[PDB]
Amino acid sequence: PNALRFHMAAEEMEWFNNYKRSLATYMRSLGGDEGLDITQDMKPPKSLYIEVRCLKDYGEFEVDDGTSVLLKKNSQHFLPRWKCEQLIRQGVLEHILS
Amino acid sequence: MFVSDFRKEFYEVVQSQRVLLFVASDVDALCACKILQALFQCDHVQYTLVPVSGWQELETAFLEHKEQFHYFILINCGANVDLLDILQPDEDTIFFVCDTHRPVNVVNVYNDTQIKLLIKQDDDLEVPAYEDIFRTMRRRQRREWEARRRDILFDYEQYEYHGTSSAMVMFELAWMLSKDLNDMLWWAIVGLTDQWVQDKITQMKYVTDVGVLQRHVSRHNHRNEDEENTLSVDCTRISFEYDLRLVLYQHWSLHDSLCNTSYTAARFKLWSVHGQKRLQEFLADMGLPLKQVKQKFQAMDISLKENLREMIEESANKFGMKDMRVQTFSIHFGFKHKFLASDVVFATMSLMESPEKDGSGTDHFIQALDSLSRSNLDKLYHGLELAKKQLRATQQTIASCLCTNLVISQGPFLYCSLMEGTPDVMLFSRPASLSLLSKHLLKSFVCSTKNRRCKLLPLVMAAPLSMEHGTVTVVGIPPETDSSDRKNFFGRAFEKAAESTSSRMLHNHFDLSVIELKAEDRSKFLDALISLLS
Amino acid sequence: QSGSTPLHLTHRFMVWNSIGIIRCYNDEQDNAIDVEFHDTSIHHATHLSNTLNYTIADLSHEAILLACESTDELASKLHCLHFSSWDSSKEWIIDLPQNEDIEAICLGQGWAAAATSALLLRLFTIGGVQKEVFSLAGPVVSMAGHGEQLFIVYHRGTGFDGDQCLGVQLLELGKKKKQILHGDPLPLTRKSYLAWIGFSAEGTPCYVDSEGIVRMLNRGLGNTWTPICNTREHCKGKSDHYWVVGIHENPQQLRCIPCKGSRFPPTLPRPAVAILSFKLPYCQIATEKGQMEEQFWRSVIFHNHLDYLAKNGYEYEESTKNQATKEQQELLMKMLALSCKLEREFRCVELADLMTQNAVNLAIKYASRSRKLILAQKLSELAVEKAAEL
Amino acid sequence: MDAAEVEFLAEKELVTIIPNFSLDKIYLIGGDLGPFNPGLPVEVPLWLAINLKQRQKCRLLPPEWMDVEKLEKMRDHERKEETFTPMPSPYYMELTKLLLNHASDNIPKADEIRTLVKDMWDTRIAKLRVSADSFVRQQEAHAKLDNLTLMEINTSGTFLTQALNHMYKLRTNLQP
Amino acid sequence: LTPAELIERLEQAWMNEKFAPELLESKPEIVECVMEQLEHMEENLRRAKREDLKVSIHQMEMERIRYVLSSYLRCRLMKIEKFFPHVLEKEKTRPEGEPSSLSPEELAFAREFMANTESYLKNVALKHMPPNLQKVDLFRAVPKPDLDSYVFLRVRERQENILVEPDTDEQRDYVIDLEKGSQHLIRYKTIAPLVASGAVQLI
């Protein structure tokens, strides 16, 4: 976020960009092709699908090739966990079963 | 067209598809949504759920989502209007409509391709035949047929009312799928109890639906249980109760329950100064100490409680309250969690219609929907506290109206108006809470007045809604006789008055008998209503 | 009734088979019947208000059948819910004559049957129309059915010294109606009574006595009764025993519920069905020479149902016959090789008598290996004999 | 290691279910399962069993060790012995939580089972506390903890290991 | 190597890497084979119909395998980022025959990480510092992994004459025997070859 980027030095941003590029290279080199995103699956998998609630007014978010969900606030969607994990991590969505 | 088999022609269709739920803001709608959510989550149906509080936001949500979804489900909305004209859909969408509102619009009934009604055919339905409604001496008979059409269709569209609970419909679907969990049966019970609490159905129909639900309760109570093998205290137990009509009486004092229940408050006239002595006479006739009666029910002495229901009935019979009992249900789980269906209804309803300004109405919908799951018992108990506050505010408002004589008999109908800035008007600004207030106030008025004429009239109530646009919410209520069939004409009377006066009437709520009206036009609107009802 | 528990219980099974379970309870809150299925794709679970006190039941792929006793106000009735029907009215009810009561009932493919206290059997179609009527040859005990087959057991007389006097009446109600067994007495272990009757899943009739022997109608051996197994060799204890749910020919399975200290399983908690394989009670069991022929005879004893289906006019899976014949031929080939290397030949000829023409022409190779020329000669002569037996 | 990861490993344990659906043998990477026949028992991993129970597709049976008399005997043996006794499962606490939270309807006497497993857990955690205190007091360099389970270790082990690292450095600071 | 046994060795590596204080020797065969299984099963399942139960069961099992692999690789990357000068020095000084502690991909990542960090430090402050102070050797700046950490273990193959060394004084050293299935709490440095050889499983 921009409010946090203003805390960083320019050289710190350069280091962070180099680290991001190197990490992306490493993840890309793991598999036969398309790599493995080891940023995903940060917690052990329980259910294949989860129910999520929109916290922010995001735009649209694709789930299949031709299909997308409108992430309007207070709407609830039942979607794959591996698709929703990053948005939940970033606070766009809320996992709503406990 | 009516769906004959929910399993074959609705569920097995939408099971393979992305689906969009439009859900109305009422407890029966919430319960049906919970049941349908549970089925979809069992089958991994990738649904999206949108709350809608009215027609315009339903149209907005449909405009937002119509590109991405081909199958839509409307819960407690859509059946009583021409959905094709309202939404202007593409030629190949499908609208499944599970809605209690009656009469079903004739276009919805006789549309055979796009609108699919999840409505039981054995409901109180009398649809006019297709040839009576749809297409020199020949053109003379054409005009005569058109006149007969206007007559018949007015006779059909006159009286609005409610049919079988959508939660019960979805539970019958769950039963046919044999994925009916005990919490789904509880949600069905809560939907029917929402209908009963809000007086949307007759007592005969409520007793019949309770008779239906009793058999499901027995089946669930013998799935893994009998008189000698019993389950953990963790498991949920639903029990049939011939319980008391008092509201929330297991969660606050019996005194507060008797004071804030609509029936006993109306009978004892507790708005009046003299009514408290009538209530004290009732309690002395029972033989309950006032300290125990004012103590919280869970802290009351247990020697007073194990025959309290029949004691209440026996004293009520000789006080003239001949029906203090009611056929209802309760749910137990764990050691201490116990709720009547009425308790869950009032808690969820208060979470929906909360007076809190923070967040929004959709956030309050979300709170109410969360509170129906047992992972959010804290939300349910918070809703119970809000329900106590709401009931107290209701009685204070009724007392203000009756003491100030705001209820004035406008010939064909009684009339009342809330005033801006007076206490709790912001709590009652929302149409559902306003409808409940008007019903409770009409019962209180009918018990208060001594005139035989006034005991038979309907009531129209107004309240402020907007100052940025200067409008009021107006509701119409039928008479409160025990002979009443719970049908009212105000949905059509309001629009006849509005078109006769060319008034700025806006029609956003799903019930036709609730409208928004410019504050200036209420005078001529009321004049037209007196002229119309005659 | 097969797969049902005694009537004095206030909460009991009315039937448990490979289709599902019917329970019924008469507790203070209500009297009712619960119907459930092993596979919930079949039909949804059902709850019936048992105000008319239905007490004998049966369950099938396409219908459920119920019946009760009479009282001085009202006569006995037969009630059915044909849940698989196309039409709007899934139920039907029938009323008996005065002072007459149903005694047992059963379902079959497209028909129902009720045996009556007046020594009378009535056949019904599953839409409710009455089919033929005939009298039993004595007081009935139980009934069973599968396809067009009807299986009835009855008292033919009075027992002595602990034994039971009863026999079977077996009918085939298909496109060429017949009586297969007319009044034949049924074998059972001495000083015991009949416990369970029913058809194995692929179609053969079987039953179990109250000692534990399960036996089957051997249609490969002139419709006699062949014991398969006991249950008390698998189980242990006097009062403990296994309570039977069903039989299957392929896979060879006996579904049974182990019961501890009781003649039947308790209604709650829900019992778990154990699976029992089969092992015929032959002599010299511990030897390979015993095990091979046990495998052979058990295989044919079960797989003759395919030939019964073909004889009745049904189509079946030919791969089952291929696998069964291959198993029999392969065990025979291996043991022929072993006995030949052990230098025995007449026993090899007796084993080879059960084989095909091609099989003996190939078994000459096993005879030739290790140079048992006389066994090769007798296998060639047997090949000539099989060419004649064609 | 998190308690959720300990639960993830507990989820690999095999339990018996009774399906209400028909499905042929399925050849999972971690070993084949099935066939699934309606009404008959079949043994499957706990994650799959819990998922099928949640989707209403089976009835779960208690393990052989979830019996009140057996658990009372094990609890009394644990309370009497000074060392950790052998446990009926290496993930008995996790098994108890998962099975009783998702299948108490199927498992009779679940309250008694939960209370007895809680008794065993309390006794064994007390024994582990005694072991840690004795280690630090007597300045041990090695301990034998044969019958402890992974969840029981993981509850206290991070704290204990950090403390012992500090203790080792404090008692070896004079080495040069 | 059976697929079930492959996933078992993956779990063993996962737990050992969790509890070991240092970066353990790489298991490239494990990582490559597990990824092959996952890609193959994705290929299998993309060619099957919707609403099928076995498809979902396979997807759940794949999620579990993917989680263990991702967590294992994340832990190794944490260790590499924590001890990047020391693992690089070890790889540079490694003789011929012992296995590497880094895969080629991990080694490329480690070299890039060290170059990036040194460049950042120089540019921000250490080109501005006086001339003889401009060089920090990160081999001395970064701490080494602490091999005297206490670890829990379960032992898989019997070991004898394992020497416990309580403190500085050699007189207090004493030997023990590790019976199969026993569990122990012990310093890592005394058991590190056993962890390498798989004779013990850290818990």
What DSSP string describes B209-243? HHHHHHHHHHHHHTSS--SS----SSS-EEEEEEE
- Do D96 and D16 lie in one domain? The reply is no
Alpha-carbon distances of B220 from B179, B372, D56, E82, E196, rounded to whole Å:
12, 19, 15, 58, 57
| Phi, psi angles (nearest 5°) of residue C313 | 105, 10
- Do D33 and D11 lie in one domain? The reply is yes
CA end-to-end span of chain D, whole Å? 35
Residue D100 belongs to domain with CATH number? 1.20.58.1020
- Do D59 and D114 lie in one domain? The reply is no
Instruction: Select the residue of E53, E185, E203 nearest D143 (Cβ to Cβ).
Output: E185
Experimental method: cryo-EM
Q: Does B226 touch chain C (CB under 8 A)?
A: yes
Q: Does E203 touch chain D (CB under 8 A)?
A: yes
CB atoms A72 and B64 under 8 Å: yes
- CA nearest to A75, candidates B97, B366, B356: B366
- Do D47 and D76 lie in one domain? The reply is no
- Do D117 and D34 lie in one domain? The reply is no
DSSP string, B501-526: HT--EE--SSSTTEEEEETTTHHHHH
Measured distance CA(B504)–CA(B506) in Å, rounded: 7
Which residues in chain E touch residue D161, judged by CB atoms under 8 angstroms apart? 149-152, 185
Q: B274, exposed or middle or buried, with CB in 10 Å at 0-12, 13-18, 19+?
A: exposed
Sign of CA dihedral C130, C132, C136, C140: negative
**Among the three residues D20, D42, D66, which one is the final residue of a domain in this structure?**
D66
Cis peptide, bond prior to residue D35, ω within 30 of zero: yes
Q: Does B44 touch chain A (CB under 8 A)?
A: yes
- Do D116 and D165 lie in one domain? The reply is yes
Q: How many domains is chain D partitioned into structurally?
A: 2
B vs C, Cβ pairs < 8 A, gives: 47
**Among the three residues D66, D87, D105, which one is the final residue of a domain in this structure?**
D66
A vs D, Cβ pairs < 8 A, gives: 7
| Residue C85: other Cβ atoms inside 10 A | 15
- Do D6 and D23 lie in one domain? The reply is yes
Buried b vs exposed e over C30-40: b needs ≥16 C-beta within 10 Å?
bbbbbbbbbbb
- Do D42 and D90 lie in one domain? The reply is no
Q: Are E75 and E23 in contact (CB under 8 A)?
A: no
Which chain A residues in 75-94 lie under 8 Å from chain D, judged by CB atoms?
none
**Domain housing D153:** 67-175
Q: Does E182 touch chain D (CB under 8 A)?
A: yes
**Among the three residues D66, D90, D115, which one is the final residue of a domain in this structure?**
D66
- Cα angle at C134 between C128 and C138, to 5 degrees? 125
CB neighbours of C277 closer than 8 A, spacing ≥ 6? C252, C253, C254
Measured distance CA(B3)–CA(B115) in Å, rounded: 10
Q: Which pair of tokens denotes residue B419?
A: 């005033």
Which SS3 state, helix, strand or coil, does residue B277 take? helix
Instruction: Select the residue of E66, E112, E123 nearest A41 (Cβ to Cβ).
Output: E66
Nearest-10 crossing angle of helices B275-286, B308-319: 130
- Do D101 and D161 lie in one domain? The reply is yes
Measured distance CA(B50)–CA(B63) in Å, rounded: 13
Closest chain B residue by Cα to residue C29:
B218
Q: Are B407 and B416 in contact (CB under 8 A)?
A: yes
Which SS3 state, helix, strand or coil, does residue A50 take? strand
- Do D50 and D132 lie in one domain? The reply is no
Which residues in chain C touch residue D106, judged by CB atoms under 8 angstroms apart? 269-270
Which of D1, D6, D8 is the best residue to mutate to test the A interface, defined by the most A CB atoms within 10 Å of its own CB? D8
Residue D53 belongs to domain with CATH number? 3.40.5.50
Instruction: Select the residue of D143, D148, D172 nearest E167 (Cβ to Cβ).
Output: D172
Q: Which residues of D touch A (CB under 8 A)?
A: 4-5, 7-8, 51, 54
Instruction: Select the residue of A72, A78, A97 nearest B46 (Cβ to Cβ).
Output: A78
Q: What are the helix (H) ranges across A1-98?
A: 2-5, 10-28, 81-89
Q: How far is CA B449 from the centre of its chain?
A: 27
> Do β-strands B459-466 and E200-202 pair in parallel, antiparallel, or remain unpaired?
unpaired
Q: Does B425 touch chain C (CB under 8 A)?
A: no
Q: What are the helix (H) ranges across C102-204?
A: none
Q: Are B45 and A78 in contact (CB under 8 A)?
A: yes
CB atoms A44 and D51 under 8 Å: no
* Residues facing C7 on adjacent strands: none
Query: D96 to chain C, minimum CA–CA distance in Å?
Result: 19
- Do D96 and D167 lie in one domain? The reply is yes
Q: Which chains are adjacent to chain D, needing at least 3 Cβ pairs under 8 Å?
A: A, B, C, E
Evaluate whether chains C and A are touching (3 or more beta carbon pairs less than 8 Å apart): no
Which residues in chain D touch residue C272, judged by CB atoms under 8 angstroms apart? 16, 18, 41, 61
| Residue B357: other Cβ atoms inside 10 A | 7
Closest chain B residue by Cα to residue E52:
B43
Which residues in chain E touch residue B44, judged by CB atoms under 8 angstroms apart? 51, 56
- Do D96 and D160 lie in one domain? The reply is yes
**Helices and strands (H, E) in chain C, number of each type:** 5, 23
Q: Which pair of tokens denotes residue B106?
A: 């004739």
DSSP string, E44-113: HHHTS-TT-HHHHHHHHHHHHHHHHHHHHHHHHHHHHHHSHHHHHHHHHH--SSSPPSS-HHHHHHHHHH
Which residues in chain D touch residue E60, judged by CB atoms under 8 angstroms apart? 47-48, 51
Which SS3 state, helix, strand or coil, does residue B99 take? coil
DSSP string, D22-77: -B--B--TT--B--B-TTS-EEEEHHHHHHHHHTT-EEEPPPTT--HHHHHHHHHH
Closest chain A residue by Cα to residue D7:
A44
Q: Does E57 touch chain A (CB under 8 A)?
A: no
| Residue E170: other Cβ atoms inside 10 A | 7
